[PDB]
Design an enzyme around this catalytic site. Structure first.
Site, short mmCIF file in Angstrom:
data_model
loop_
_atom_site.label_atom_id
_atom_site.label_comp_id
_atom_site.label_asym_id
_atom_site.label_seq_id
_atom_site.Cartn_x
_atom_site.Cartn_y
_atom_site.Cartn_z
N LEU A 1 -44.69 -10.08 -15.34
CA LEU A 1 -44.84 -10.45 -16.74
C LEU A 1 -45.18 -11.92 -16.96
CD1 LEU A 1 -41.70 -8.55 -18.17
CD2 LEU A 1 -44.11 -7.77 -18.26
N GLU B 1 -32.97 -9.20 -20.76
CA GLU B 1 -33.54 -8.34 -21.76
C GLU B 1 -35.06 -8.42 -21.72
OE1 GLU B 1 -32.04 -9.39 -25.56
OE2 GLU B 1 -33.18 -7.85 -26.64
N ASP C 1 -37.10 -27.22 -23.92
CA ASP C 1 -38.42 -26.66 -23.60
C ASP C 1 -39.01 -25.68 -24.61
OD1 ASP C 1 -40.66 -26.76 -21.91
OD2 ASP C 1 -39.93 -25.13 -20.63
N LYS D 1 -41.63 -24.13 -26.82
CA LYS D 1 -43.07 -24.00 -26.96
C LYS D 1 -43.39 -22.50 -27.09
CE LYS D 1 -43.44 -24.24 -21.94
NZ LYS D 1 -44.03 -25.05 -20.85
N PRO D 2 -44.58 -22.16 -27.61
CA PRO D 2 -44.92 -20.76 -27.84
C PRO D 2 -44.85 -19.90 -26.57
CG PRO D 2 -46.39 -22.14 -29.14
CD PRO D 2 -45.46 -23.08 -28.36
N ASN E 1 -42.61 -19.85 -24.44
CA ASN E 1 -41.21 -19.50 -24.13
C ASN E 1 -40.52 -18.74 -25.25
OD1 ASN E 1 -41.57 -20.84 -21.75
ND2 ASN E 1 -40.42 -22.66 -22.37
N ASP F 1 -36.34 -18.67 -21.07
CA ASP F 1 -36.60 -19.83 -20.23
C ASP F 1 -35.62 -21.00 -20.45
OD1 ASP F 1 -38.74 -18.35 -19.31
OD2 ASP F 1 -40.10 -19.14 -20.79
N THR G 1 -42.28 -30.20 -21.75
CA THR G 1 -43.72 -29.98 -21.69
C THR G 1 -44.40 -31.12 -22.47
OG1 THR G 1 -43.38 -27.61 -21.51
CG2 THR G 1 -45.57 -28.40 -22.25
O1 LIG Z 1 -42.37 -15.74 -16.56
C1 LIG Z 1 -41.67 -16.65 -16.96
C2 LIG Z 1 -40.99 -17.58 -16.00
C3 LIG Z 1 -40.17 -18.56 -16.53
C4 LIG Z 1 -39.54 -19.48 -15.71
C5 LIG Z 1 -39.71 -19.42 -14.34
C6 LIG Z 1 -40.50 -18.42 -13.82
CL1 LIG Z 1 -40.63 -18.28 -12.09
C7 LIG Z 1 -41.16 -17.51 -14.62
C8 LIG Z 1 -41.48 -16.88 -18.45
C9 LIG Z 1 -42.22 -18.14 -18.94
N1 LIG Z 1 -42.70 -17.92 -20.32
C10 LIG Z 1 -42.33 -16.54 -20.67
C11 LIG Z 1 -42.09 -15.77 -19.35
C12 LIG Z 1 -41.25 -14.53 -19.55
C13 LIG Z 1 -41.88 -13.31 -19.73
C14 LIG Z 1 -41.18 -12.19 -20.15
C15 LIG Z 1 -39.81 -12.29 -20.39
C16 LIG Z 1 -39.04 -11.16 -20.94
O2 LIG Z 1 -39.56 -10.09 -21.25
N2 LIG Z 1 -37.70 -11.41 -21.13
C17 LIG Z 1 -37.12 -12.59 -20.82
N3 LIG Z 1 -37.76 -13.64 -20.33
C18 LIG Z 1 -39.14 -13.49 -20.14
C19 LIG Z 1 -39.87 -14.61 -19.71
#
Ligand SMILES: O=C(c1cccc(Cl)c1)[C@H]1CNC[C@@H]1c1ccc2c(=O)[nH]cnc2c1
Lengths: 337, 20
Positions: A36, A108, A153, A155-156, A158, A171, A188
């Site tokens: 994702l 979640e 942090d 931002k859109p 997150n 995040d 950021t």
């Molecule tokens: O993939 C992510 C991520 C964030 C921090 C470290 C690493 Cl390794 C990966 C985050 C960053 N921006 C959003 C992304 C993400 C995607 C989906 C979900 C979700 O469905 N539920 C909770 N958190 C998510 C984070």
């Protein structure tokens, strides 16, 4: 109920903060499906809990890479804070655990995808649309700040959209529990308060500066300070002269002038009246803050749905196999995880 | 236009954090 909840919330958080839940699941309990999103030292995958059939978003972090990038304390911060908090607009940590190679945070799943995707596609949000989201962030920051937590942090990218069109803040990688001030250069570039850039020491007021950037970016379609390189962005932030799109309402402009305020003694969110300087601002005149909290307001945008396990609202990412070494890596560093 | 300048910039995709 934006008063009664906060009272009970502090007592509940402190208990979990002082005695964090640890090792509450195992990797073999989940079917991994699809990536994702990705990050400096890991990725987030859609998974299905086999026993209950529930879908979740599993964050997988390579211990070795965390150490090499000196993010150990930040990673311990993230998991300890996430397991302790509870608020309608925060993603839930369902499970966490670790193995020889990785750290796992099972959270979640937000089927609506990231605000970022929608915002870039549409260009910009209407002021009522932006207001709806911004209200949830104001409530969330009120909650986090009540617990001595800074987020650091916004931002859109997150902000996830749930099945009902409401925000889930994800995040917590830079979240920190701090009374007083702190000094880490993190966040950021577009979203950094001038205090952070000038390495002066800073407090929870950086989150309210970030709220200003977020609202600007939501309503304009671009942030107030952008360039091709971070240093040029930093230069614009410290000079600090914001210019608004002509379609920005007078009320929106006044709010942003009070959030994108270099002077901490004048920045909304950081005055003696705290968050109510924001809640009571004319731009939020139409907002029923309790209705927002109770999730009784009609969302501007409900994402296209589908049977759970659908990821239409997500970008596709290169899939990689999750390797687990036969030897334990960085055990002492992540003892408390 | 400011929008066209944004769209022509290198920072319209997902933005990486800094740390540290
Ligand atoms: O993939 C992510 C991520 C964030 C921090 C470290 C690493 Cl390794 C990966 C985050 C960053 N921006 C959003 C992304 C993400 C995607 C989906 C979900 C979700 O469905 N539920 C909770 N958190 C998510 C984070």
């Amino acid at each position: 109920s934006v008063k009664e909840f906060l009272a009970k919330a502090k007592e509940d958080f402190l208990k979990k903060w002082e005695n964090p839940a640890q090792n509450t699941a195992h990797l073999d309990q989940f079917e991994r499906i699809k990536t994702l999103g990705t990050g400096s030292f890991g990725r987030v995958m859609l998974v299905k809990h086999m026993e209950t059939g529930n879908h979740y978003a599993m964050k997988i972090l390579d211990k070795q890479k965390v150490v090499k990038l000196k993010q150990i304390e930040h990673t311990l911060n993230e998991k300890r804070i996430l397991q302790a908090v509870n608020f309608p607009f925060l993603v839930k940590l369902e499970f966490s655990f670790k193995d020889n190679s990785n750290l796992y945070m099972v959270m979640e799943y937000a089927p609506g995808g990231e605000m970022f995707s929608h915002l870039r596609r549409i260009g910009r949000f209407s002021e009522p649309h932006a207001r709806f989201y911004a209200a949830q962030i104001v409530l969330t920051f009120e909650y986090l700040h009540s617990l001595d937590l800074i987020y650091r942090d916004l931002k859109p990218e997150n902000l996830m959209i749930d099945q009902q069109g409401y925000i889930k803040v994800t995040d917590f990688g830079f979240a920190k529990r701090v009374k007083g001030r702190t000094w880490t250069l993190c966040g950021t570039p577009e979203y950094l308060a001038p205090e952070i850039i000038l390495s002066k020491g800073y407090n929870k007021a950086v989150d309210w500066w970030a709220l200003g950037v977020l609202i600007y970016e939501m309503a304009a379609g671009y942030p107030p300070f952008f360039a091709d390189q971070p240093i040029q962005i930093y230069e614009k932030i410290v000079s600090g002269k914001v210019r608004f799109p002509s379609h920005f309402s007078s009320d929106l402009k006044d709010l942003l002038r009070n959030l994108l305020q270099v002077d901490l003694t004048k920045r909304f969110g950081n005055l003696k009246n705290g968050v109510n300087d924001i809640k009571n601002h004319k731009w939020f005149a139409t907002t029923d803050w309790i209705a927002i909290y109770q999730r009784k307001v009609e969302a501007p945008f409900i994402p296209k749905f589908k049977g759970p396990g659908d990821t239409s609202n997500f970008d596709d990412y290169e899939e990689e196999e999750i390797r687990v070494s036969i030897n334990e890596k960085c055990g002492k560093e992540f003892s408390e995880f | 236009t400011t929008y066209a300048d944004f769209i022509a910039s290198g920072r319209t995709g997902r933005r990486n954090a800094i740390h540290d």
